Write a protein that binds this DNA or RNA. Structure first.
Length: 91
RNA sequence: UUGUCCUCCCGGGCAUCGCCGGGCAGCUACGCCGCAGCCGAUAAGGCCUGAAAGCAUCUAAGGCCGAAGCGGCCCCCGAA
Protein backbone atom coordinates (compact mmCIF):
# COMPACT_ATOMS: atom_id res chain seq x y z
CA UNK A 1 0.00 0.00 0.00
CA UNK A 2 1.19 3.50 -0.88
CA UNK A 3 -0.48 5.07 2.17
CA UNK A 4 -2.61 4.22 5.18
CA UNK A 5 -5.71 5.54 3.41
CA UNK A 6 -6.79 7.82 0.57
CA UNK A 7 -9.52 10.45 0.86
CA UNK A 8 -10.48 12.66 -2.10
CA UNK A 9 -13.01 15.46 -1.58
CA UNK A 10 -15.20 17.23 -4.14
CA UNK A 11 -16.92 20.40 -2.95
CA UNK A 12 -20.63 20.80 -3.69
CA UNK A 13 -21.72 24.32 -4.74
CA UNK A 14 -24.87 25.91 -3.38
CA UNK A 15 -27.04 25.28 -6.43
CA UNK A 16 -26.17 21.58 -6.72
CA UNK A 17 -27.40 18.75 -4.49
CA UNK A 18 -25.57 15.42 -4.53
CA UNK A 19 -26.98 12.12 -3.27
CA UNK A 20 -25.40 8.66 -3.04
CA UNK A 21 -27.20 5.31 -2.88
CA UNK A 22 -25.16 2.11 -2.92
CA UNK A 23 -22.63 2.55 -5.72
CA UNK A 24 -24.62 5.10 -7.77
CA UNK A 25 -24.33 8.88 -7.41
CA UNK A 26 -26.91 11.47 -8.48
CA UNK A 27 -26.14 15.16 -9.06
CA UNK A 28 -29.05 17.60 -9.39
CA UNK A 29 -28.83 21.25 -10.35
CA UNK A 30 -30.64 24.09 -12.12
CA UNK A 31 -29.96 22.61 -15.58
CA UNK A 32 -30.79 18.92 -15.13
CA UNK A 33 -29.96 15.67 -13.36
CA UNK A 34 -27.02 13.31 -13.83
CA UNK A 35 -26.38 9.74 -12.71
CA UNK A 36 -23.52 7.31 -12.69
CA UNK A 37 -22.44 4.06 -11.03
CA UNK A 38 -18.92 4.39 -9.59
CA UNK A 39 -17.81 0.93 -8.47
CA UNK A 40 -14.37 -0.27 -7.41
CA UNK A 41 -13.75 -2.97 -4.77
CA UNK A 42 -12.86 -1.21 -1.53
CA UNK A 43 -13.78 2.34 -2.59
CA UNK A 44 -16.78 3.89 -0.83
CA UNK A 45 -18.43 7.20 -1.70
CA UNK A 46 -20.39 9.26 0.83
CA UNK A 47 -21.46 12.87 1.36
CA UNK A 48 -20.02 14.71 4.37
CA UNK A 49 -21.00 18.30 5.17
CA UNK A 50 -20.63 20.02 1.79
CA UNK A 51 -18.27 17.58 0.10
CA UNK A 52 -18.48 14.23 -1.67
CA UNK A 53 -15.82 11.91 -0.26
CA UNK A 54 -14.16 9.03 -2.10
CA UNK A 55 -12.34 7.00 0.54
CA UNK A 56 -10.33 3.79 0.70
CA UNK A 57 -8.11 1.97 3.19
CA UNK A 58 -4.53 0.95 2.37
CA UNK A 59 -4.82 1.85 -1.33
CA UNK A 60 -2.43 0.88 -4.10
CA UNK A 61 -1.32 2.72 -7.23
CA UNK A 62 -4.30 1.56 -9.29
CA UNK A 63 -6.67 2.33 -6.42
CA UNK A 64 -5.31 5.88 -6.22
CA UNK A 65 -5.74 6.30 -9.98
CA UNK A 66 -9.33 5.03 -9.81
CA UNK A 67 -10.19 7.34 -6.92
CA UNK A 68 -8.73 10.37 -8.69
CA UNK A 69 -10.62 9.64 -11.91
CA UNK A 70 -13.85 9.17 -9.94
CA UNK A 71 -13.32 12.56 -8.30
CA UNK A 72 -12.69 14.08 -11.73
CA UNK A 73 -15.92 12.55 -13.05
CA UNK A 74 -17.95 13.91 -10.13
CA UNK A 75 -16.43 17.36 -10.68
CA UNK A 76 -17.39 17.07 -14.35
CA UNK A 77 -20.96 16.24 -13.34
CA UNK A 78 -21.15 19.30 -11.08
CA UNK A 79 -19.65 21.51 -13.78
CA UNK A 80 -22.04 20.26 -16.45
CA UNK A 81 -25.12 20.59 -14.29
CA UNK A 82 -24.18 24.12 -13.16
CA UNK A 83 -23.12 25.71 -16.45
CA UNK A 84 -22.95 22.85 -18.95
CA UNK A 85 -20.54 22.28 -21.82
CA UNK A 86 -20.12 23.68 -25.33
CA UNK A 87 -17.90 22.42 -28.17
CA UNK A 88 -16.98 24.32 -31.35
CA UNK A 89 -16.25 22.82 -34.77
CA UNK A 90 -15.09 24.41 -38.02
CA UNK A 91 -16.20 23.16 -41.44
C1' U B 1 -33.56 -49.67 -100.72
C1' U B 2 -29.21 -54.14 -101.53
C1' G B 3 -28.13 -59.81 -101.34
C1' U B 4 -30.70 -64.12 -100.51
C1' C B 5 -34.98 -67.59 -99.14
C1' C B 6 -40.50 -68.47 -98.59
C1' U B 7 -42.53 -70.27 -106.69
C1' C B 8 -44.39 -65.12 -108.76
C1' C B 9 -48.12 -60.59 -106.77
C1' C B 10 -49.30 -58.76 -101.92
C1' G B 11 -46.94 -60.15 -97.27
C1' G B 12 -42.59 -61.91 -94.44
C1' G B 13 -37.36 -64.56 -92.14
C1' C B 14 -31.83 -63.44 -91.95
C1' A B 15 -27.75 -60.23 -93.18
C1' U B 16 -24.96 -54.96 -86.54
C1' C B 17 -31.84 -52.60 -85.89
C1' G B 18 -28.95 -55.42 -92.85
C1' C B 19 -28.08 -50.23 -94.27
C1' C B 20 -30.10 -45.12 -95.03
C1' G B 21 -33.69 -40.67 -93.83
C1' G B 22 -37.27 -38.93 -90.37
C1' G B 23 -39.15 -39.71 -85.45
C1' C B 24 -43.64 -38.51 -80.55
C1' A B 25 -43.34 -40.24 -75.22
C1' G B 26 -39.04 -40.97 -71.77
C1' C B 27 -33.85 -39.54 -70.42
C1' U B 28 -30.70 -35.85 -71.28
C1' A B 29 -27.39 -30.70 -72.25
C1' C B 30 -25.20 -27.87 -76.01
C1' G B 31 -31.36 -25.92 -73.73
C1' C B 32 -34.45 -23.17 -69.84
C1' C B 33 -35.64 -21.37 -64.84
C1' G B 34 -34.11 -19.92 -59.27
C1' C B 35 -29.91 -18.48 -55.55
C1' A B 36 -31.50 -11.75 -49.15
C1' G B 37 -28.52 -8.06 -48.13
C1' C B 38 -30.16 -6.48 -43.22
C1' C B 39 -29.70 -6.95 -38.06
C1' G B 40 -25.79 -8.36 -33.15
C1' A B 41 -21.06 -8.68 -31.23
C1' U B 42 -15.87 -8.22 -32.73
C1' A B 43 -10.02 -8.15 -35.08
C1' A B 44 -6.48 -4.35 -37.03
C1' G B 45 -7.46 0.66 -36.97
C1' G B 46 -10.01 5.72 -36.10
C1' C B 47 -12.09 8.39 -31.59
C1' C B 48 -14.64 10.53 -26.61
C1' U B 49 -14.18 11.01 -21.08
C1' G B 50 -9.95 10.42 -17.81
C1' A B 51 -6.15 9.84 -13.87
C1' A B 52 -1.78 7.33 -12.38
C1' A B 53 2.07 11.68 -13.41
C1' G B 54 -1.83 19.53 -10.63
C1' C B 55 -0.13 19.43 -17.57
C1' A B 56 -0.42 15.98 -21.49
C1' U B 57 -2.36 11.32 -22.88
C1' C B 58 -7.49 6.27 -27.17
C1' U B 59 -6.44 2.83 -21.41
C1' A B 60 -5.36 1.99 -16.29
C1' A B 61 -11.54 2.16 -14.78
C1' G B 62 -15.53 3.72 -18.42
C1' G B 63 -17.92 4.65 -23.58
C1' C B 64 -18.86 5.08 -29.39
C1' C B 65 -17.90 3.56 -34.28
C1' G B 66 -15.33 -0.46 -37.19
C1' A B 67 -14.01 -6.53 -41.97
C1' A B 68 -15.58 -11.19 -48.18
C1' G B 69 -14.20 -13.03 -41.16
C1' C B 70 -17.96 -14.83 -36.31
C1' G B 71 -23.51 -15.52 -34.64
C1' G B 72 -29.09 -14.91 -36.66
C1' C B 73 -32.52 -14.32 -40.40
C1' C B 74 -32.45 -18.45 -45.37
C1' C B 75 -32.07 -23.78 -47.25
C1' C B 76 -31.48 -29.61 -46.24
C1' C B 77 -31.76 -34.03 -42.37
C1' G B 78 -34.19 -34.20 -37.81
C1' A B 79 -38.71 -37.82 -31.72
C1' A B 80 -33.27 -42.74 -29.95
Amino acid sequence: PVDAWIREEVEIPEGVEVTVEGYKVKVKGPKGELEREFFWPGIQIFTEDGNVVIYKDFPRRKDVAIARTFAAHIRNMIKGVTEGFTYKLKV
